[PDB]
């Protein structure tokens, strides 16, 4: 089976160098060109460049020219994508794929690259207080690094009405997410609501009670 296998996810900081790999198997690697493609989270595919591994001929998109170096070592069936100085804006998924009479018939599984200036940091947890007979309340899990955080409500006992959103990576290099639960208006004051926030990387466990105004 023809395969391309890429190196594992990377978490790096601005200015650091990085070289990720794309390893071919089940075919003659030297005889087919390898393209590299960027995909910003939630965005489309962007062609970055291409390399002929037989002779090291490389061409780049004008958008990526000078920002990145594509290379290959045909003796070990591997192509590479390399940055001398990562930017936060390089945070993306990167795929390799081979040109073929069926072009890009085979793709790598992708390498996620996360670039942030942040050190490990536990979140600040802020209550989102409630203001057809139900009320929406939640917790703001602010300014943490890296992924992931776990959120539960009332130690897991409260699961209905709960939605915990995906995180945003802010311009600051830190993540934020939110978690909401819909609850009956008449249960406010009487019934107690606590979000349980777990951030393993920093060993932070926060219990925040969310109460009305």
């Amino acid at each position: 089976e023809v395969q391309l296998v890429q190196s594992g996810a990377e978490v790096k900081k601005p200015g650091e160098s990085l070289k990720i790999s794309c390893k071919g198997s089940g075919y003659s690697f030297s005889n087919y060109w390898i393209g590299w493609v960027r995909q910003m989270p939630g965005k489309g595919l962007e062609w970055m460049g291409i390399i002929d591994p037989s002779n090291s001929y490389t061409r780049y998109s004008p958008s990526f020219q000078g920002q990145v170096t594509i290379s290959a070592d045909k003796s070990i069936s591997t192509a590479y994508l390399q940055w001398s100085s990562l930017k936060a804006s390089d945070t993306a998924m990167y795929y390799c794929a081979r040109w073929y009479y069926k072009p890009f018939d085979v793709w790598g599984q992708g390498t996620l690259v996360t670039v942030s200036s942040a050190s490990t940091k536990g979140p600040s947890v802020f209550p989102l207080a409630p203001s057809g007979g139900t009320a929406a309340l939640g917790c703001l899990v602010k300014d943490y690094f890296p992924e992931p955080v776990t959120v539960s409500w009332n130690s897991g006992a409260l699961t209905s009405g709960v939605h915990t959103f995906p995180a945003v990576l802010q311009s600051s290099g830190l993540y934020s997410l939110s978690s909401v639960v819909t609850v009956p208006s008449s249960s406010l004051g009487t019934q107690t609501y606590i979000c349980n926030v777990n951030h393993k990387p920093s060993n932070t466990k926060v219990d925040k009670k969310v109460e009305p105004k």
């Binding site: 009479y101 890009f104 989102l128 939640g138 939605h163 995906p166």
Partner: protein
């Protein structure tokens, strides 16, 4: 400026039929190059769907077909299925400054449940956050379908694009969609304006919520 142009979105119901155009320029389709199509399901690598204008790789059902006439390529999908829901990209070799060009992509939505307008909850900055010298407005968007929204923030009546972060919609357990948007402000900014608005546009209709510093 070798470019391949695709509509941002197409939709059809299960069992129905869609077409996705891919309009080229003189350097790509214009120069005689073949067009190829890629299907990308959420969280996966793109998959070759059509190559050389109209040929199907093995494993691709005949429900998918491609054509290319003039400077326009097109992908047709018949008997739509929910697993067809995905982003579709056209691509070609090209003669310009680039060697390979991808179209901007087309999100295919398979309309298997009814349209639902978003419910919007806008939270003002908490007391605890303000005493920490920060202020974040939290706009939560729930129970909508299909899973696409545009969020616009207003300070009084003027647009604010600075300090905005918005999540791509994801499924709630009840199988509708939810999204979130944040506006980061200094406590000074929060206090200096009369009110702030989160405006969510879904299927051409806008639902707006407003919070003011002075109200409890």
């Amino acid at each position: 400026q070798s470019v391949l142009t695709q509509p941002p979105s197409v939709s059809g119901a299960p069992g129905q039929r869609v077409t996705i155009s891919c309009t080229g320029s003189s350097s790509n389709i214009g120069s005689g190059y073949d067009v190829h199509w890629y299907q990308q399901l959420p969280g996966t690598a793109p998959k070759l769907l059509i190559y050389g204008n109209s040929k199907r790789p093995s494993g691709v059902p005949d429900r998918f077909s491609g054509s290319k006439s003039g400077t326009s390529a097109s992908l047709a999908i018949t008997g739509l299925q929910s697993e067809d829901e995905a982003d579709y990209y056209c691509a070609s070799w090209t003669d310009g400054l680039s060697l390979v060009v991808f179209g901007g992509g087309t999100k295919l939505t398979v309309l298997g449940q009814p349209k639902a307008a978003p419910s919007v909850t806008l939270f003002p900055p908490s007391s605890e956050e303000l005493q920490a010298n920060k202020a974040t407005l939290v706009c939560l968007i729930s129970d909508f379908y299909p899973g696409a929204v545009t969020v616009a923030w207003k300070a009084d009546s003027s647009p604010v694009k600075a300090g905005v972060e918005t999540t791509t919609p994801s499924k709630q357990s009840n199988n509708k969609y939810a999204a979130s948007s944040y506006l980061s402000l200094t406590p000074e900014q929060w206090k200096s304006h009369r009110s702030y608005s989160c405006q969510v546009t879904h299927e051409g209709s806008t639902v707006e919520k407003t919070v003011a510093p002075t109200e409890c």
